Homo-oligomer: A and B are copies of this chain.
Amino acid sequence: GVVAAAEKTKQGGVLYVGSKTKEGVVHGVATVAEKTKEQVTNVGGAVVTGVTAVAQKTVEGAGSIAAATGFVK
- A-side residues, CB < 8 A to B, are 1-73
Contact = CB atoms under 8 A, between A and B. Distances in A.
B4 A1 contact: no
A4 B51 CA distance: 33
Contacts of A73: 71-73
| Count of chain copies | 10
B33 A30 contact: no
B51 A52 contact: yes
Nearest to A53: B50
Given A24-B26, A28-B49, A42-B42, 17 more contacts: A4-B5, A13-B15, A14-B16, A23-B23, A25-B26, A27-B49, A28-B28, A29-B49, A38-B39, A38-B40, A40-B69, A41-B41, A41-B42, A49-B53, A57-B60, A65-B65, A70-B71
